[PDB]
């Protein structure tokens, strides 16, 4: 196996096609990273050559991506969050987000009271939809059956458990509270 | 190539080159305008104690009960059904922000826009994601004012076929008081180019669209015979706008023909403008008179 | 264009810092220091209604509006 | 020509063989002219109707009204009298949706 530097001759446009993290010019394929030389043969020949470091310390979000978050504060019409994980991998820093009162459920419906959906301190799984404005920057959504709060936390510091699609209950004091439970 | 470096010349005051006396009524701030029994204040004046006091330099213009003062230098003020030209400076969640040389910014609502497709298919929140993609930062449009807000703001719409994103050409910005009110601000001058006389002071010059909204890019080279016409109109517009001239179709046509004898590159001198503006002045005098 | 061998300052700047009986005795941890849950169903297996899916399939199938 | 008067019996040979998917069902039975208009209305056609009963002509009207929410568009109903203007609103309020 061989590694890369962010420029070198790799292949012709006839001997393969550019993949992820690469660029081409003057009929040649040029590297743009310092990762590893991967040639996805796939099926149909002409492998899509690409270079991947495979050790992602940081990664910029996209138009569509799954992210693990952490609520900071909640408002009657939005809920500021902090992006913590990009899908699976840990993130070295923390970005910001905002869930408007249209992205909670998968119907973009009326009602949907924000107060009992995303209580602060929880950890949720959500998907971005846009690159946002300067007020709200990433505009995340949870309009799916698989998205919502996944690992909640009790009033007094006890791991919480899902109890229904909308209700969760404390194991110690048997107290009933409202969340937006995502499928496991 | 000689790199002429001339020296400043003293200005001749009083406009003695022609000689005229004004019959109007001129005022300065603090002057007491007519103070008869009952009158209504206009724009440019205010009221003190039983007095109509002018608040800006200009000339009084009255239509049968109304004392007002018309200043000679202002910024654009919006009116319903007015052709304007502007540039996008902010792209928001549900609107754009357009700069049109006004006291505030102008809002182009997403509800009023000929979206790509140009027909009845649908309008929903799926378009909102890509709305901020085509009308990006720093583009040029040409729309019409819709209504007046409660704080002097203007909302402008693009609900026609002649309005929308513009293409190639040059832009010339002047004061919004040298454009003559008319009923056709779109022109197709028989020279090789066109023009849009924005009521806000934005003049847009583009070539004729060959035969026959921003859907077409047409980012292909423009013929040599078209640039020389655009440059000629650009310089002639600068020449008429500089001294006094109010801009409209006949003045530009008259000056363009008068500019043929000598080259387009050499018309930047203080005197060549005078010898062209005066010739257009006398052509207007021998035609209107 | 010959590359060279390091010297003290560089070879000390590039240091990687990555049971075996007992030492430093006083600093061990032992020397220095009912729950009846009645838990509910542990997860909620979503085997049931999931309203968004309800309202969508409901209206699409229904398709009557009367 | 721009004007085609469809014969009262000639066009219709079948109604449910076409339009495989359902529509705004009626408790009672639909007449020949209502199905004649429904067949054309599906193709986004222009329809003129000249009949005698009042509510009989409203079947195609509420067919179009129910068809708009499947297209997410909007429709306008014009009633040049105040009493009838709100009766249709009351009829369609409890019936479905928002008016």
Curated annotation (Swiss-Prot), chain A:
One of its GO terms (molecular function) is RNA binding. CDD domains: S1_CSL4. InterPro entries: Csl4 (IPR039771), EXOSC1_C (IPR019495), Exosome_cplx_N_dom (IPR025721), NA-bd_OB-fold (IPR012340), S1_domain (IPR003029). The keyword Transferase does not apply. It comes from the Eukaryota. The modification Phosphoserine is found at residues 17, 94. It is linked to Pontocerebellar hypoplasia 1F: A form of pontocerebellar hypoplasia, a disorder characterized by structural defects of the pons and cerebellum, evident upon brain imaging. PCH1F is an autosomal recessive form characterized by hypotonia, global developmental delay, poor overall growth, and dysmorphic facial features. Brain imaging shows pontocerebellar hypoplasia, thin corpus callosum, cerebral atrophy, and delayed myelination. This is Exosome complex component CSL4. It comes from Homo sapiens (Human).
From Swiss-Prot, chain B:
The gene is EXOSC2. The modification Phosphoserine is found at residue 124. Non-catalytic component of the RNA exosome complex which has 3'->5' exoribonuclease activity and participates in a multitude of cellular RNA processing and degradation events. In the nucleus, the RNA exosome complex is involved in proper maturation of stable RNA species such as rRNA, snRNA and snoRNA, in the elimination of RNA processing by-products and non-coding 'pervasive' transcripts, such as antisense RNA species and promoter-upstream transcripts (PROMPTs), and of mRNAs with processing defects, thereby limiting or excluding their export to the cytoplasm. Signal peptide: none annotated. GO terms for cellular component: cytoplasm; cytoplasmic exosome (RNase complex); cytosol; exosome (RNase complex); nuclear exosome (RNase complex); nucleolar exosome (RNase complex); nucleolus; nucleoplasm. It is linked to Short stature, hearing loss, retinitis pigmentosa, and distinctive facies: An autosomal recessive disorder characterized by childhood myopia, early onset retinitis pigmentosa, progressive sensorineural hearing loss, hypothyroidism, short stature, brachydactyly, recognisable facial gestalt, premature ageing and mild intellectual disability. The keyword Nucleus applies. One of its GO terms (biological process) is RNA catabolic process. Residues 79-159 form the S1 motif domain. Belongs to the RRP4 family. It holds the Pfam family RRP4_S1. Keywords: Cytoplasm, Deafness, Disease variant, Dwarfism, Exosome, Nucleus, Phosphoprotein, Retinitis pigmentosa, RNA-binding, rRNA processing. Disulfide bonds: none annotated. The lineage of its organism: Eukaryota, Metazoa, Chordata, Craniata, Vertebrata. The keyword rRNA processing applies. It is found in: Cytoplasm; Nucleus, Nucleolus; Nucleus. This is Exosome complex component RRP4. One of its GO terms (molecular function) is 7S RNA binding.
UniProtKB/Swiss-Prot annotation, chain D:
It is found in: Nucleus; Cytoplasm. ATP binds at residues 51-58. Transmembrane segments: none annotated. It comes from the Eukaryota. Component of the SKI complex which consists of SKIC2, SKIC3 and SKIC8. Interacts with HBS1L isoform 2. Belongs to the helicase family. SKI2 subfamily. It is linked to Trichohepatoenteric syndrome 2: A syndrome characterized by intrauterine growth retardation, severe diarrhea in infancy requiring total parenteral nutrition, facial dysmorphism, immunodeficiency, and hair abnormalities, mostly trichorrhexis nodosa. Hepatic involvement contributes to the poor prognosis of affected patients. Helicase component of the SKI complex, a multiprotein complex that assists the RNA-degrading exosome during the mRNA decay and quality-control pathways. The SKI complex catalyzes mRNA extraction from 80S ribosomal complexes in the 3'-5' direction and channels mRNA to the cytosolic exosome for degradation. SKI-mediated extraction of mRNA from stalled ribosomes allow binding of the Pelota-HBS1L complex and subsequent ribosome disassembly by ABCE1 for ribosome recycling. In the nucleus, the SKI complex associates with transcriptionally active genes in a manner dependent on PAF1 complex (PAF1C). This is Superkiller complex protein 2. It comes from Homo sapiens. The chain holds residues 282 to 380 of 1246 of the full protein.
